[PDB]
Structures are given as structure tokens and as C-alpha cells.
Structure 1
Amino acid sequence: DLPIRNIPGNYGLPIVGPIKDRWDYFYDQGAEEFFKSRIRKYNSTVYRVNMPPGAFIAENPQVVALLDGKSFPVLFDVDKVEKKDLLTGTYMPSTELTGGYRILSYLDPSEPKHEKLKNLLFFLLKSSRNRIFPEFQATYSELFDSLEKELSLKGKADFGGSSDGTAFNFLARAFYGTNPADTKLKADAPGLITKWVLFNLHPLLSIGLPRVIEEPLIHTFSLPPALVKSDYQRLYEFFLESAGEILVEADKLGISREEATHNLLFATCFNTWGGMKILFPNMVKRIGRAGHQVHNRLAEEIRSVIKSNGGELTMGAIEKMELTKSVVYECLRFEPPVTAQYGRAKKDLVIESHDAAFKVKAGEMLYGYQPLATRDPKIFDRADEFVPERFVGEEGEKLLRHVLWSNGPETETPTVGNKQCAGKDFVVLVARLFVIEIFRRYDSFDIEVGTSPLGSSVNFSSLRKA
């Protein structure tokens, strides 16, 4: 059996310990090296550490970090961890930001409204099933038209600053059969959502600014929700007026119209649009870096399969695209869009890692940095390499149980009883559609890459048309 080890690490002195750890995390090391340096120092993938934000935003920055793929899955086990009010970690954004409601993502499965609200989103997704393909193809075709246009003018095309409007338009049309251009939102949604997301997540982000500016402005106190209230109201009235069909189902599930609307706003703007804002530019970055031979292989597969399908792109056609499916899973393994999962121990636990077991007490906050679980070299070969074909074939597919992007194994299903992403299948689908749209149009591409507060900044510098 595994030896019991004391959990290494410490929290330093009051006040100054957490501050120095925050400086390492944001400025002097960055998240990955913050965690890896401590793995090396402590010779352990489980250890005590302070997490941001602390200061006057979080009451208690103290966590036990789980940084390997054996220990991490404890965070999925709803019998071992409580998942209440910890979506964003050791603080929770004011409910003033969300209409006075505790939204679904913050609810533990023991709360009755968790089941109701998750069932509502499952309905939203199922009801959209026949709109996803045509609306994705229409909106993303327009995006690539715009990018070609920009490349011709500037010699480079900024992906993110057009793709955010594309994603919102796509979601409004797919989920609600509504074109935002036909509404009072016009083209304003990305700006409105970005500001509101910043008010929620600023304690966890760096914008770029020097620490002497950022620390007092975004890392010490919460930004006042009052300042984003009017912007949120514009979004709210869009959802109230556009979500008629879904609100009928909310009524049947026994959810108030107002509670339903705030929840649809959050699922659409925060979970979906926000998640896509991180994922899509990251996919362009990693696929871009994979090189032109990989691009050509994807183009050849995708185009051949669609030709075999009489030119009609369907769910069944996608199942034939082995490399495409594998590349999407490899993006999600290599660079999980949301890196931080938390859970509070409900009872005394014994957590097993690769070489030791550790005991934690009821009430301890557990934290996982997902990239260290999904790039764990004790689980994956070539763990730090992006390998496009990793998940191709029977043996490769077995490894999907260790892909964790959805807050559960990729082989498992989200349910009302767990806290796995309600949109799991939707995300994988639209990520596949995104790769398909690129390579049906282009043989290959080149990119330029920079940092962004969320995800990556990506420019196309060449788009080689078919």
C-alpha cells in the first residue's frame, strides 16, 4: 500500500505570505511555474499553498493543491467534496452581479434548484440541435470572410476582436433563433459581456499593467457591481425577450421566469461565450503550431469525408473524421480552458497520489490546477507535446478517461447529480465544427501569438485557400 505522508508546504506569515505567493503567481513566476517550482521544492504533487486573491476579497487563501491525475479526480466526487459557492475559488462574486440570485454554477447538487436549472440547460441544448450546424456554418463563414478582408488590408488579421461577435451571434441564433442585429443589442454584446466578466473575475486575472497599478486596482478589493448594472440590464432584457420557447420549459420545470432568465443569461454569456472566448483562440494557436503537414492531413481528411457524405456535413460524418476528433481532444488535454477547480472536503478524506497517500480534514479547501493532471507524465506518454493523433483508434480512445476539461472524465456524462459541465457534448461539437470550417476553406495557415487576460491573442498572417 501507499505510505502516508504529511502534506508538505506552508502558508508563510499572516498577510505577507499570501501577498508574496500572489506576486509569484501573477508576476514573478506565472501559474505553471508557480506550481511546478513547488512540486520540485516539496518533491510532491500534493502540497499546501496560498491561492489568489486573498487580500480583502477572499476570507481564506489557504488550500491543499492536487497536481497529478491520480489525486485530482477527488474534485469530481460529490460524496467527498462540497461544491457550493466555489466556482471561482476562495471568493464568490456578489450576487448583485447576477440579479440577486445564486446562479446554477454556484449550487451544490444537494440544492433542489440545482436539478431544476441543470435540466433547463439540458433542454436548451437538446432543443437547439437542428439549428447548430446551419447557424455555425453561416456565422463562422462570415468571420472567415472578415479575416480574409483584414489580412488583405493589414497583412495580419486579429482573430479575437472579430470572433467574439461571431460567437455571440452564433449562440443567439442557435439557442434562441434570434439575430442580435435585429434587436436593441445590435453589435454591443461582446463589449457588455466583457465588462461584466471583468467585474466577476478580476481578482483572478492580470490585464498586463504593472503590479503597482494592478495590485491596488484589481487585486485588493472587489470592483463595485453598481457600475455594471445598466450594462447587465441590457443583456437581461435581450434574454427575457428572446428566450420565449425556453422560458415555457422553465415554467414546466417549476422555475420562475426571472430566475430562469438570469440563469440563461449566465449560461450563455459566462459559461458558453466566455468558455469559447478562451478555447477557440487557444485551438488556433496549438493547431497553428502543429505545422503545415498536420494542416494538410486535416484538410485531406475533412474534405474527403464530406465528399463521401454527398457534401452534407452531419453528426455521422464527423464520427469518420478521426484526426479531427483527436486534435480537438488534444487541445482540451494540452490546454484545459479553465484551469482551476475547487472543492471543500465534506468529511475526513484519504487522497491517493502516485507515490504516497495524504489525509485531509473535513472543511479543508481542495484545489486542482488541471493542466498538471492532464499533462501528468505518469498517465500520458509525450505528456508535454501536442500530439494531434493521440486519441486515434481503440487504444487512444481509452485515454479519454483522463481528459478532464469538463470537470469530469471525458468518458462520463454530466447529470443533475454531479457538477460536470452541462454543455460537455455541445463544446466538443462546436470545437469540431470550428476545425472543420477552417480546413474545408484553407489548406494551411500561419499565426502570430500574444498574451491575453483570458486565453491567447492570435493573429493570422497567412490563410492559404483551398
Structure 2
Amino acid sequence: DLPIRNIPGNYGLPIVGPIKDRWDYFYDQGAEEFFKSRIRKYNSTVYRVNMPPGAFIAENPQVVALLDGKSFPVLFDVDKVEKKDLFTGTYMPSTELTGGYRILSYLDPSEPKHEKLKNLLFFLLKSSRNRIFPEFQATYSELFDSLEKELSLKGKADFGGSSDGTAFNFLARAFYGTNPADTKLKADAPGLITKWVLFNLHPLLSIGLPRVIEEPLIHTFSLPPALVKSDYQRLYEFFLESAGEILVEADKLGISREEATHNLLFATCFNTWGGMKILFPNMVKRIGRAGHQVHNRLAEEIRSVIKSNGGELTMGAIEKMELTKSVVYECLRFEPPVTAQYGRAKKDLVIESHDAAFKVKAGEMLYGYQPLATRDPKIFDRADEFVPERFVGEEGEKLLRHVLWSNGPETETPTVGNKQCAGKDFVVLVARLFVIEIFRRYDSFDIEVGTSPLGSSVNFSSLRKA
């Protein structure tokens, strides 16, 4: 059996310990090296560390970090960890940002509204099923048209600053049968959502500014919710007016129209659009780096399969696209779009890692940095390599139990009883549709890459048409 080890690490002095750790995290090391350097110092993938934001935003920055794929899954076990008000970590954004409600993402499964609200989203997703393919194909076709246009003008085409509009338009049309162009939102939604998301997440992000500016401006106190209330109201009225069919189901589930609307707004703008804002540019980055031979192989598979399917893209056709499925899973393994999962121990726990076990007391905040679980070399071979074909075949597919992007194993299903992403199957579907739309159109592409507060900044520098 595993030896019991004392959890190494410490929190430094009051005030200055957490500040120095925050500087390492944001500025002097960056998140990955912040965690890896301490794995090396402590010779442990489980240790005590301060997490941002601390300061006057979070009451208590002290966590136990789980940084391997054996210990990490404790964070999924709702009998071991409480998942209340910790969606964003050791602080929670003001409910003033969300209509006065504690939104689904912050609710522990022990709360009755968790079941009701998650069921509402499951319905939203199921009811959209026959709109997803045609609306994705129409909206993303327009995006690539615009990218070709921009490339012809500038010699490069900024992906993110067009793809954010495309994502919102797609979601509005697929979920609500509503084109934002036909509404008072016009083309404003991305800007509105970006500002509102910033008011929620600024304690966790760097914008690029020098630390002397950023630290007092976004890392010490919460930005005032009052400043984004009118923008939020524009979004709220769009959802109230557009989500009629879904609101009928909300009524049947016993959810108030107001609560349902705030939750639909959040699920659409924050969970879905925000998650896509991170995922899609990251996918372009990793697939771009994979090189033209991989591009050509994806193009060959995708086009051949669609031809075999009489030109009709369907769920069943996608199941034949083995390399495509595997590439999407590898993007999610290599670069989890959301790196930070938290859980508060409900009771005393014994947490097993690879070489030792650790005891934590009820009330301790557990934290996992997902990339270190999903690139754990004791679980995955070639762990730090992007391997397009990793999940192809019976043996490859077994490894999906260790892909954790959704806050649970990829082999598991989100339920009203767990805190796994309500949109798990939707995300994997639209990520596949994204790769499919790229390679039905292009043989290969080249990219330029930069940093972004969320995800990656990506430009196309070449789009080689079929």
C-alpha cells in the first residue's frame, strides 16, 4: 500500500506570501511553470500553495493542489467534495452580475435547483439537435468567407475577432432559432459579453499590462458590477424575447421565467460562447502546428467520408472520421480549455497519488491544474506531444477515461447528480464540426500565434483551398 506522506509546501507570510505567489503565477513564471517548479522543489504532485486572487477579492487563497491524473479525479466525486460557489475558485463574482441569482454553475448538486436548471440545459441542447448542423455550416461558412477576404487584403486574417461574432450568431440560431442581426443586439453581442465576462473573471487573468498597472486595477479589488449592468440588460432582453420555446420547458420544470432567463443567458454567453472563445483558437493553434501532412490526412478522411455519405454530413458520418475524432480529443487532452477545477473536502479524505497518499481535513480547499493531470506521463505516453492519432482504435479509445476537459472522465455522462459539464456532448460535436468545416474547404493552412487573456490569439497567414 502507498505510504502516507505529509503534504509539502507552505503559504509564506501573511499578505506577502500570497502576493509573491501571485506575481510568480501571472508574471515571473506563468501558471504551468508556477506548478511545475514547485512539483520539482517539493518532489510531489500534491502540495500546499496560494492561488490568485487573494487580496481583497478572495477570503482565503490557501489550497491543496492536485497535479497528477491519479489524485485529480477526487475533484469529480460529489460525495467527497462540495461544489458550492467555487466555479471560479476561492472567490465568487457578485450575484449583482447575474440578476441577483446564484446561477447553476455555482450550485452544489445537493441544492434542488441544480437538478431543475441542469435539466433545463439538457432540454435546450436536445431540442436544438436538428438545427446544429445546418446553422453551424451556414455561420462558419460566412466566417471562412470573411477570413479569405481579410487574408486577401492584409496577408493575414485575425481568427478571434471574427470568430467571436460567428460563435454567438451560431448559438442564437441553433439554440433559439434567432438571428441576432434581426434583433436590437445587431452585431453587438461579442463586445457586451466580453466586457461582462471580464467583470466576472478579471481576478484570474492578465490582460498584458505591466504589473504596476494590473495589480491595483484588476488583482486587488472587484470591478464594480454597476458598470456592466446596462450591457447585461441588453443581453437579458435578447434572451427573454428569443427563448420562448425553452421558457415553456422551464415553466414545466418549475423554474421561474426570470431565473430561467438569467440561467439561459449565462449558459449561452458564459459557459458556451466563453468556452468556445478559448477552445476554437486553441484548436486552430494545435492543429496548425501539427503540420501540412496531418492537414492533408484530415482533409482526405473528411472528404472521403462525406462522399461515402452521399454528400450529407450526419452524426453517423462523423463516427467514421477516426482521425478527426481523435484530433479533437487530443486538443482537449493537450490543452484543457479551462485549467482550474476546485472542490472543498466535505469530510476527512485520503487522496492517493502515484507514489504516496495524503490526508486532508474536512473544509480544506482542493484545487487541480488540469493540464498536469491530462499530460501526466504516468498515464499517457508521449505526454507532452500533440499526437493527432492518439485516440484512434480500441486501445486508444480506452484512454478517453483520462481526458478530463468537462470536469469528469470523457467516458462518463453529465447528470443532475454530478458537476460534469452539461454541454459535454455538444462541445465535442461542435469541435468536430469546426475541424470538418476547415478541411472540407482547405487542404492545409498556416498560422501566426500570440497570447490572449483567454486562450490564444491566432491569425491565418495561408488558407490553401481544395
TM above 0.5 = yes
Give me the whole-angstrom Cα distance separating, in 2, the residues matched to 1:280 and 1:219.
27
C-alpha distance in structure 2 between counterparts of 1:414 and 1:372, whole Å: 23
Report the number of matched residues. Answer: 466
Q: Deviation digits for residues 423-463 of structure 1, max 9, x if unmatched?
A: 00000000000000000000000000000000000000000
Equivalent-residue separation in structure 2 for 1:313 and 1:353 (angstroms)? 43
Unpaired segments of 5 or more residues in structure 1? none
1:60, 1:146 → 2: CA distance? 46
Q: Distance in 2 between matches of 1:442 and 1:74?
A: 42
Partner of 1:324: 324
Q: Distance in 2 between matches of 1:129 and 1:174?
A: 8
Deviation, structure 1 residue 274: 0.0
How far 1:214 moved relative to its partner?
0.1
CA distance in 2, matches of 1:153, 1:90: 46
User: Within 2, Cα distance between the matches of 1:246 and 1:220?
Assistant: 39
Once the two structures are superposed, residues 209-237 of structure 1 have per-residue CA deviations (whole angstroms, 9 ceiling, x without a partner) of: 00000000000000000000000000000
Partner Cα distance (1:47, 1:407) in 2? 21
SS at 1:63 equivalent: strand
Q: CA deviation at 1:312?
A: 0.2
Q: For residue 313 of structure 1, give the secondary structure of its aligned residue in structure 2.
A: coil
Residue deviations 1:355-390 (CA, integer Å, cap 9, x gap):
000000000000000000000000000000000000
Distance 1:95 1:49 in 2: 28
Instruction: Report the Cα offset of residue 83 of structure 1.
Output: 0.1
Distance (whole Å) between structure 2 residues aligned to residue 150 and residue 99 of structure 1: 39
Q: CA deviation at 1:49?
A: 0.1
Match of 1:347 in 2: 347
Shift of 1:5: 0.1
Structure 1 SS opposite 2:252: helix
Q: CA deviation at 1:18?
A: 0.1
Offset of 1:165 from its aligned partner? 0.1
Is 2:199 aligned against 1:199?
yes
The CA distance in 2 between the partners of 1:446 and 1:185, in whole Å, is 34
- 3-state SS in 2 of match to 1:47: strand
- State the alpha-carbon separation in 2 of the partners of residues 276 and 106 from structure 1: 20
SS at match of 1:144: helix
Name the CA distance, whole Å, in 2 between partners of 1:193 and 1:145.
Answer: 24
Residue 323 of structure 1, CA deviation: 0.1
Tell me how far 1:393 sits from its aligned partner.
0.1
Measured against aligned partners, the alpha-carbon deviations of 1:114-168 in whole angstroms (never above 9, x if no partner) come to 0000000000000000000000000000000000000000000000000000000
Please report how far the alpha carbon of residue 13 of structure 1 lies from its aligned counterpart in structure 2 after TM superposition. 0.2
Deviation at 1:398, TM superposition (A): 0.2
SS at match of 1:230: helix
Give 3-state SS (helix, strand or coil) of 2:60's partner.
coil
Q: Deviations over 1:62-99 (max 9, x none)?
A: 00000000000000000000000000000000000000
Match of 1:88 in 2: 88
Q: Residue 343 of structure 1: CA displacement?
A: 0.1
Per-residue deviation at 1:17?
0.1
**Distance between the aligned counterparts of 1:54 and 1:399, measured in 2?**
36
CA distance in 1, matches of 2:12, 2:435: 46
Q: Give, in whole Å, the separation in 2 of the partners of 1:288 and 1:206.
A: 25
CA shift, 1:325, in A, is: 0.1
Query: Percent of aligned pairs with the same residue?
Result: 100
CA distance in structure 2 between the partners assigned to 1:238 and 1:181 by the alignment: 11
| Partners of 1:289 and 1:193 in 2: CA distance | 30
State the Cα distance separating 1:309 from its structure 2 match. 0.2
**Residue deviations 1:387-424 (CA, integer Å, cap 9, x gap):** 00000000000000000000000000000000000000
User: Which secondary structure state, in structure 1, belongs to the residue aligned with residue 461 of structure 2?
Assistant: strand
Q: TM-score, structure 1 length as denominator?
A: 1.00
Deviation at 1:347, TM superposition (A): 0.1
Q: Secondary structure at the match of 2:74?
A: helix
SS of corresponding position for 2:172: helix
Deviation at 1:248, TM superposition (A): 0.2
Counterparts of 1:247 and 1:280 in 2: how far apart (Å)? 29
Residue aligned with 1:383, SS: coil
Distance 1:436 1:12 in 2: 50
CA-CA distance at 1:315 after TM superposition: 0.1
Distance in 2 (alpha carbons) for counterparts of 1:206 and 1:13: 24
Distance 2:260 2:297 in 1: 44
Q: CA deviation at 1:58?
A: 0.2
Measure, in 1, the Cα distance between the counterparts of 2:136 and 2:24. 41
Q: TM-score, normalised by structure 2?
A: 1.00
Show CA shifts across 1:322-355 (max 9, x none).
Answer: 0000000000000000000000000000000000
User: Unmatched 5+ residue regions in structure 2?
Assistant: none
Q: Report deviation, 1:57.
A: 0.2
Q: Note the C-alpha offset of 1:266.
A: 0.1
